Structure of Hemagglutinin-neuraminidase:
Amino acid sequence: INDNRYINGINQFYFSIAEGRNLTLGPLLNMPSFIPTATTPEGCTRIPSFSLTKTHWCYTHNVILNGCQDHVSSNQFVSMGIIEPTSAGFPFFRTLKTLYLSDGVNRKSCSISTVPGGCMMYCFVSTQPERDDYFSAAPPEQRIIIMYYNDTIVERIINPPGVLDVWATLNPGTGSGVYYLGWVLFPIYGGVIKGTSLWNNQANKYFIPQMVAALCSQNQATQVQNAKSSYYSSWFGNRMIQSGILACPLRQDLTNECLVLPFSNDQVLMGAEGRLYMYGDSVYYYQRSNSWWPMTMLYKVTITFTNGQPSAISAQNVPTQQVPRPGTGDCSATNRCPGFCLTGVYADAWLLTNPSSTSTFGSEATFTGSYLNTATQRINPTMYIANNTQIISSQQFGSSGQEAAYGHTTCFRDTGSVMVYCIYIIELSSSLLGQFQIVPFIRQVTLS
Amino acid sequence: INDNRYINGINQFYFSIAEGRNLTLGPLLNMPSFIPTATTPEGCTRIPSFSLTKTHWCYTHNVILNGCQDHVSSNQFVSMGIIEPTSAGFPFFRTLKTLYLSDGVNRKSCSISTVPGGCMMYCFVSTQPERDDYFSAAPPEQRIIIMYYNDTIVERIINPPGVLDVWATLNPGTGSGVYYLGWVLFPIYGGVIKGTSLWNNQANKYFIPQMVAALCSQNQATQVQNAKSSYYSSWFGNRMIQSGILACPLRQDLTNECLVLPFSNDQVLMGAEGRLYMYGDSVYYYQRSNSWWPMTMLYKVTITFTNGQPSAISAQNVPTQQVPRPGTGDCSATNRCPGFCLTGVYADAWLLTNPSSTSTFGSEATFTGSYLNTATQRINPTMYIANNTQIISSQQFGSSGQEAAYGHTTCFRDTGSVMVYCIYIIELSSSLLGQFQIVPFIRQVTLS
Amino acid sequence: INDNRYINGINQFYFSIAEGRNLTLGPLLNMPSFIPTATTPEGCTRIPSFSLTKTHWCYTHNVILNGCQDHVSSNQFVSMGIIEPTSAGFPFFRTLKTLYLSDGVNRKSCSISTVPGGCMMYCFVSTQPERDDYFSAAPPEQRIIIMYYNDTIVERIINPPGVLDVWATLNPGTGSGVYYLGWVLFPIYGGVIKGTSLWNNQANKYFIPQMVAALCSQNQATQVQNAKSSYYSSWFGNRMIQSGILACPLRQDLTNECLVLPFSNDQVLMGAEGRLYMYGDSVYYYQRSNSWWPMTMLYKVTITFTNGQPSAISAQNVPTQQVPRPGTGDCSATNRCPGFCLTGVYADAWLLTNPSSTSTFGSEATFTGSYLNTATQRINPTMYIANNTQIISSQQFGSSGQEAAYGHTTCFRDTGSVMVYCIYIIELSSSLLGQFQIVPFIRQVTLS
Amino acid sequence: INDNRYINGINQFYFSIAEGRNLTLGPLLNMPSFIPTATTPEGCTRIPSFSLTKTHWCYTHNVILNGCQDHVSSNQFVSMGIIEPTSAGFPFFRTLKTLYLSDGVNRKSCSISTVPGGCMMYCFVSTQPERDDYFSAAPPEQRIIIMYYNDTIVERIINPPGVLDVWATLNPGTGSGVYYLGWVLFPIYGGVIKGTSLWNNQANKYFIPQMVAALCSQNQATQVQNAKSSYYSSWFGNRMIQSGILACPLRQDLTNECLVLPFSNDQVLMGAEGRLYMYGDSVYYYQRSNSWWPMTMLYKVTITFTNGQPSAISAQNVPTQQVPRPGTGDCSATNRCPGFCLTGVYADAWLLTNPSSTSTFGSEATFTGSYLNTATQRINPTMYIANNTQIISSQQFGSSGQEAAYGHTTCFRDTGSVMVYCIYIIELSSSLLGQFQIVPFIRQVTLS
Ligand SMILES: *[C@@H]1O[C@H](CO)[C@@H](O[C@@H]2O[C@H](CO)[C@@H](O)[C@H](O)[C@H]2NC(C)=O)[C@H](O)[C@H]1NC(C)=O
Ligand SMILES: *[C@@H]1O[C@H](CO)[C@@H](O[C@@H]2O[C@H](CO)[C@@H](O)[C@H](O)[C@H]2NC(C)=O)[C@H](O)[C@H]1NC(C)=O
Ligand SMILES: *[C@@H]1O[C@H](CO)[C@@H](O[C@@H]2O[C@H](CO)[C@@H](O)[C@H](O)[C@H]2NC(C)=O)[C@H](O)[C@H]1NC(C)=O
Ligand SMILES: *[C@@H]1O[C@H](CO)[C@@H](O[C@@H]2O[C@H](CO)[C@@H](O)[C@H](O)[C@H]2NC(C)=O)[C@H](O)[C@H]1NC(C)=O
Ligand SMILES: *[C@@H]1O[C@H](CO)[C@@H](O[C@@H]2O[C@H](CO)[C@@H](O)[C@H](O)[C@H]2NC(C)=O)[C@H](O)[C@H]1NC(C)=O
Ligand SMILES: *[C@@H]1O[C@H](CO)[C@@H](O[C@@H]2O[C@H](CO)[C@@H](O)[C@H](O)[C@H]2NC(C)=O)[C@H](O)[C@H]1NC(C)=O
Ligand SMILES: *[C@@H]1O[C@H](CO)[C@@H](O[C@@H]2O[C@H](CO)[C@@H](O)[C@H](O)[C@H]2NC(C)=O)[C@H](O)[C@H]1NC(C)=O
Ligand SMILES: *[C@H]1O[C@H](CO)[C@@H](O)[C@H](O)[C@H]1NC(C)=O
Ligand SMILES: *[C@H]1O[C@H](CO)[C@@H](O)[C@H](O)[C@H]1NC(C)=O
Ligand SMILES: *[C@H]1O[C@H](CO)[C@@H](O)[C@H](O)[C@H]1NC(C)=O
Ligand SMILES: *[C@H]1O[C@H](CO)[C@@H](O)[C@H](O)[C@H]1NC(C)=O
Ligand SMILES: [Ca+2]
Ligand SMILES: [Ca+2]
Ligand SMILES: [Ca+2]
Ligand SMILES: [Ca+2]
């Protein structure tokens, strides 16, 4: 279990609106990395997922032996432990168990989540190029693995209702899932088949960020038309790219009890990887901007239960125009107009301030994370702190040109020294060992 | 506990003299590294120690926050686990516990050793520059820490007899120690004070490798004179630099039961870092060439017990002229003549063949490890396989100019697939994160 | 252990009814304070708890680094020792052990109690403003820590039955607890949820001090109506503010063996901080007047055991109209009429005379303590001796305007010189170091 | 025993000459004070002594019940404990034992010193006004008390040789003593009788600080004449006011084994209170400027042993002109010319840099402490850091006019966080409780 210095500083809004204005990033602190490195030049470690909770943390990432492309073989590294203070005062993520799922099953796009006494991981089994998954009417196999700290492992092949013949594909969003009211929730996305109820109920729906108008040159009518079309991809088997949540009851005999809950396309953008968070009793969702809007997307999710079962989800977006992401073509970090896009990067963000603390939801929100500072390339990884309109603190890592990919940010407070530490897990392109080196950078978020 | 595939392939001579002739290094295999990385550009991780045994393995290294020089602050990372096969067939070092001794005590030059149910680590507490330790008549504080897999930790400040007023300094050799007949043996070295019994008994003693004559241009008389003098250092407080073994009975209340057993300078070269090995029932010793002879030094150690206590050690050197080490001045990799030197690097070697299997001890010995291929710089790390006179297989890592430091090599056999794997733990100078990146390279040693 | 001069003069009624009439406060005596001072101008030390017993005494208070408001960080200072005579004849509280619980867990409103061989402390973990605790249906975490004189420390998170889903919050009364018949009893208070058994059983109950009629201008019917309503607070999440006792068996593995025993609202006023005393074999309770009645509240508690377990408590009030406390609005020291109030200060009182010694319980009771002599401000700290209707001896400390807060009074007798000493622990507002300076004033209570 | 974070950061020079130039005082940190407060307005706590060592610390001060003048009654408070880190990272002086010597013996001017397993305190028994001690040919009674942590107390009346009929009076310097090579050394001072060997051997000797010339307007001849005369006081019974060291072997049966070692008046100024320090293996002495030179006086003391017994002491002054002290008349902080003076205050200083590290002893020395910033009054207590000529960092405490008296400064390093903390024990005049409040201020000495 985590040290007494952290058990009460996890999953919360750490600063008041007033304090968010005077926040800044401290120097990077040096701790023993708890994320394993490749031991060959071409070894590839990518797609991390990290979950932290009151009692412990869970970590995982995919390992491919040669290069980063392979749809036949890969192993999945899983790790878990606690946080404890060092004599310098800052955190040390102590690993208490390690696992390396290496058995021939190609588990991909895995999302992990802390659960009482262990970790629950959700993956899909890849047997062909991603694009082929969207064309095949059959969805990939889905699996959720529970790894207890007592070393018991239970893996199940799940078949949630409304997936077969509805979704051509279904993937975990790779971002962490969360344990909420006895259920484990995972972010999901994929492509829905034309003519299905979902498709029909989703018909004519679209979402446009509050701050697009002022920045977009097209008129309202044109925007609405392009927005509606951005949810359908001809390149990906002509499917409606949908975002959603997978809810699984915490059981060791899961089969078809997990529920697929898709977001209304009236509240969310085109489906993409994502991450679920927990701030107090509130669930939040991060959605990768793989569509036309290149800015960070965060939503407060309201979950409805009917007979003790999640029955519907509603998402309220925190309006911002800050922290863009590198895209391709007419969907670079400079784009502001609706249209169909299918490019981007995963770069979640952590809210240091409560969006509900302002009379108008998210009118003044502060968040932190990392982003690739460039219009179209995955270059210049930069850690930052920002509000809805501007970046108020930032520090690029390495020299310009430095390649990087995804970034997962998590913050917690030391209730002992009363300081907030954030960990920025960034996939860095390395020249020495392996294609990438997933690094858990850690630094303090100073008030002043 | 280790997988059934390894419990019977540990600490042995894996090949016959005939087979050693046809051995070669396979490609480097990619596994999740079990050695933690620094998370800042200037963070320094150095001086690793690794012990593997039938049941499990122990690992540790020193961590300094800024740069690699600091005689006030450092933390020591400890790790332990087992070996298990992956679906590709090769090993995966599974970490089952992690520890980060961070409390203000500056533990340095630590040597670690596997023990039933945990690890035993030996360190000395550094409070001043190394050179100052040799000038001060008082030896640094010595400590042995026992870390059980059940998470109990017992640390003791030891005061073995014959240290106070005999040794001005005393350090663990950083190389792994071994668990032999109920005792934990650690390699040690340091400086002895003039006029002490040890000094007197050591007087006029010297050792000259069997293969020096043919390579040295000085006459026998001149060599013997220079050799005798190479054991005394005016730069290091005018002490006799001595090598030896620290024997501690496996107890949780250690005080003065550990015994300091110095090697006869008639059988070993000037004191230096070292490592102890176990091949079957035989103990072996590796001695860093920090003196005039720049070639790999291995010895079969014969331990004598008197009343259930180690009473004396004898060392028989495996005569070789292979695998040189970068030195400074007239002590570069090209030196062959006796004289006083105090330069070099730690680069142990693993014997793949039994030296006692030949009518004349070590007449045809094969070993493997890594070395820095250059005369005076710590550059061009190269993994190899060699016999007494030549390198019969080798592969440099990275491009020329690549900086590196120490190298610890360990081999074991997969009794399942019947292949030998060796792990080469090399301190690599990295440009991205940290001063060094200690990498556990792993590859197979192929017969053919 | 305490000196022979005090082991037989602890926890008793020291004077007879006749003697109480001729009692007076001697001069303040100067002894080395055993309560630690802050070392910064804004450092805050508040909320002390003190327990004295035949063998020794226990002391504790909360420390906040900046100012007196913080619901994230605080440390708790614990101290313990004995009493021994000085050459001047008066007491000296000799500290034999000190502890500073500083680890990130925000322990608040702690109550301490002497136990054979150490101290037992009860605290709740604060993670948000007090008011928020009443609105949240979940109660704060509860903990009891046992600190043995032999330096062993055992802390447990307790979950007594009937708390979850019954009490929205639960706090220790900060006043000392007591060790009675093998159990440790602590005063508690908090808010109960509407619709719960407790709430229902407590419905329509109210208590009115015997001496209110003669001083209140409202008629009996109006008083009863207002009294009934004074137990419910809309400002504090619409909960029934309840007072009670927490009974814990003296064990090192406490979990859910502690029992919550609430007082009947027919015998006690609205819940508030409190303190438990021991006079001979009788347990007494002090209840802070945080409601409409501004006078000192003391009750003789009768505890019922069923199968060796505390099963119910009954409280009999010592009727008085003396020693008022500063309040706010229509609840100042001058108020005498029932109604809902939520203002006041902690100012316990020590009974120098037995209330059961008169044909009519408490018809002539004498007590001592300190109080803030003003109607609405926390000003003019004054030590006194009083009977039910009047203050028969008193001495204000400092000049008018002097700020102060809580006051804990404890008396004991020197069986050697046959004099009674009382210690008045008062939180004094200081101008030099720290927000407050908790001072253990000590003086004799003279007969004549 | 002290925490592992401090056992290796005690009694040393913490910074290099280069680093001393960039040092500054951090904010005052708030910790629970370990120095007891008075509990009456006129109670007087004065003359503290503090000793810190690798294993623990010792503290003591005098307590007079009414006012600060009394030569009949006083008690002496003794305290001892260890240092341990708090969750905020800074020190907490944990008291593990307390003692209050209250028995009628008027122990005064006590100096305390850490010793293996306890404290050794040296006091003299006062039975009359100080001035009368100088006129009486008989010296006051001398006593050394040893207080073991195991609660054994041994007090002895010592009669060292060469005191009776040589010294009219003899007092401990109140500053801490030190445990050196098996002996406890205490600073002493007093008045020597005319015609005694000491007096004669001391005849015509005088000392003039290296930096007086440049600041004094008198010529060399005049200075030497006035300097010689400054060692004799007609007001104090016409005695030679001498400074020195009392060396006692660590024994429980001390009688006349302690040795009085006076300083040569050719190396030290007129006798005064003082303190002994230990920096590594070197002993240092602080001498109160109770004479004409108003600046901080520090000396490196070289102790000579003859047959295992201290036989002579030599003192080398660290030349400075910084940190003056309030004096009276022609001896205020502005005085620079030799002459007879008998005014001043105790204000020791801690060397943060080694004086022997410069080619010319003390050419660039940095020290810290507190001083009363005013020419003649004991007002404006100010903590500072200074070099030989200037104050490079300082912060006055309280508002101008604030009265204070003595100041004892001690620094140590946290080898964990690598920061230096200094504790400044200052006697502050308080308006609330007691004449003075001896406060242990603590703050960090930052490099940058
Ligand atoms: C490790 O912990 C898990 C968590 O409880 C144990 O799981 C139980 O497994 C049994 C059957 O194997 C089920 O009937 C229980 O319902 C499970 N407990 C619950 C409710 O989670 C698991 O058995 C533990 N490992 C072992 C066997 O020691
Ligand atoms: C985000 O932060 C920026 C910078 O801190 C805010 O912009 C400042 O707004 C104030 C007025 O409130 C101006 O006085 C400053 O000049 C602005 N800074 C500059 C020059 O950019 C911005 O208001 C914040 N956005 C919000 C409200 O979320
Ligand atoms: C973890 O394993 C060790 C290894 O045995 C246990 O050590 C024993 O400790 C007790 C006292 O603590 C000794 O009296 C025994 O002799 C030790 N066993 C031996 C011979 O090694 C240790 O106690 C275990 N941890 C716990 C307490 O569960
Ligand atoms: C070490 O290995 C080398 C190379 O394998 C051995 O040298 C060979 O020796 C054979 C005779 O036994 C010759 O026929 C080859 O021509 C040699 N190789 C060359 C060209 O270098 C060497 O003998 C081995 N050293 C020993 C005996 O340990
Ligand atoms: C509390 O103390 C007061 C004062 O000591 C008592 O009042 C006195 O009562 C006697 C009669 O018993 C009168 O002769 C005095 O004149 C009263 N003193 C004055 C002038 O106030 C009072 O009776 C006591 N209250 C009780 C009975 O507890
Ligand atoms: C507390 O510790 C001291 C320190 O040793 C003990 O002192 C010993 O006392 C005996 C006689 O009382 C002497 O003969 C020894 O020489 C002392 N030890 C030394 C060398 O310091 C003391 O006895 C201890 N308290 C007790 C009695 O438990
Ligand atoms: C003590 O500190 C002062 C201030 O840091 C030193 O004075 C500075 O000396 C440098 C040259 O070495 C000048 O460039 C600065 O202008 C000086 N500061 C000022 C304006 O006072 C002083 O030299 C130090 N004394 C020593 C050498 O111990
Ligand atoms: C933050 O800093 C600004 C500028 O120094 C200051 O005025 C403001 O009060 C601070 N805000 C808070 C409440 O921390
Ligand atoms: C090794 O290889 C050589 C050359 O192919 C072969 O002649 C020899 O028999 C082999 N040695 C053994 C016994 O493995
Ligand atoms: C107390 O004092 C009164 C007045 O001097 C005296 O009459 C009375 O007897 C005393 N009471 C007792 C019993 O102490
Ligand atoms: C101290 O600070 C000065 C000014 O910033 C800098 O130039 C100097 O290098 C520092 N000195 C050291 C060695 O700390
Ligand atoms: Ca498909
Ligand atoms: Ca030494
Ligand atoms: Ca609540
Ligand atoms: Ca005298």
In short: The two ends of chain B are 32 Å apart (CA to CA).
